[PDB]
Design a protein around this nucleic acid. Structure first.
Ligand SMILES: *C[C@@](*)(O)[C@H](CCCNC(N)=[NH2+])NC(=O)[C@@H]1CCCN1C(=O)[C@H](N)Cc1ccccc1
Ligand SMILES: [Mg+2]
Ligand SMILES: [Mg+2]
Lengths: 30, 258
RNA sequence: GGGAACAAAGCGAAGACACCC
């Protein structure tokens, strides 16, 4: 998507990850 | 949101709260998609069966909020609306087919750490991500249970709630209800034999169902909380408006009104 | 083959699979 949409200031922009997003990432494998 | 957890600060910066001017009350969820456009469910603004029909002047959008009730000065932003746009083929008479609406703000909001737009998916991203078994995330300040006793505990959350849920196979969604499931909807939730629970509920409508792309790291809004039968019942699933299926209309409205 | 099809009526771990050129 255009510009920096969907990249969170307090997470993706700071290379940090929230407490449950891994669960979403894991579902693409599982 | 039922069986979810407290959201982290800045965790869903595109989260928007639709709020009534009088009486002052929370109406629905919604999402920020640009500095001046907000996406929500059409039934949040128009639903004759409940004598609901709001115009631009009746409400406010509160962006960047965490607490459901506390005014968060210098964090949240309160914006007024220039105009509302209900999908032209929105079917409130039957099953909420095309439960989608756009709201243009009077003036652009400045983004911040707590305020940032989510992306809408392109055709390929939609094809790749919206697949049975993959999980998305739903957020809202809606009811914590479908029914409850206030004398034994408050029905609404103190802060924004979040829950991750898997996308369900279409025939399974169809077989779970007698309501007709149109091609402009999808459902999500755990099956009784999966163990886990979770669902959106009344009050969560208009909130976004998002997915994080493993290929570019961006969050995309795949659905809009729309309807269900009860909340978190076994064998039942939450239904969402299929954002990509109706993206042509979204684009039209926006290219047509800046 | 392309456009259009405000994903309209329809048709599975769902994938544009009557109008115009
Ligand atoms: C308006 C939204 O807050 C709310 C969201 C419900 C989400 N529920 C679950 N389990 N995820 N939507 C509604 O309350 C809609 C508006 C019309 C009535 N309705 C329902 O969900 C009914 N329970 C079912 C229904 C009735 C008429 C047409 C479609 C669905
Ligand atoms: Mg269920
Ligand atoms: Mg259709």
């Amino acid at each position: 998507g255009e510009a920096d949409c969907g990249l969170r200031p307090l997470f993706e922009k700071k290379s940090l990850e929230d407490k449950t997003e891994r669960e979403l990432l894991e579902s693409y494998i599982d | 949101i039922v069986e979810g957890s407290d959201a982290e600060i800045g965790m869903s910066p595109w989260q928007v709260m639709l709020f009534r001017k009088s009486p002052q009350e929370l109406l629905c969820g919604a999402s920020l998609i640009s500095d001046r456009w907000v996406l929500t469910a059409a039934h949040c603004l128009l639903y004759p069966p409940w004598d609901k029909n709001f115009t631009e002047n009746d409400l406010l959008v509160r962006i960047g909020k965490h607490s459901r009730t506390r005014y968060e000065r210098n964090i949240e932003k309160i914006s007024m609306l220039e105009k509302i746009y209900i999908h032209p083929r929105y079917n409130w008479r039957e099953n909420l087919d095309r439960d989608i609406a756009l709201m243009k703000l009077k003036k652009p909001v400045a983004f911040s750490d707590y305020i940032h737009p989510v992306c809408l998916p392109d055709r390929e991203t939609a094809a790749s991500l919206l697949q049975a078994g993959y999980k998305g995330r739903v957020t809202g300040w809606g009811n914590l249970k479908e029914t409850w006793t206030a004398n034994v505990g408050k029905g609404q959350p103190s802060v924004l709630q979040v829950v991750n849920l898997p996308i369900v196979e279409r025939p399974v969604c169809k077989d779970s209800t007698r309501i007709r499931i149109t091609d402009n909807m999808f459902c999500a939730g755990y099956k009784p034999d999966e163990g886990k629970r979770g669902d959106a509920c009344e009050g969560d409508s208009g909130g976004p169902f998002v997915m994080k792309s493993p290929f570019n790291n961006r969050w995309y809004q795949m659905g809009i909380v729309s309807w269900g039968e009860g909340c978190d019942r076994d064998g039942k699933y939450g239904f969402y408006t299929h954002v990509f299926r109706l993206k042509k209309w979204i684009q039209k409205v926006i290219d047509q009104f800046g």
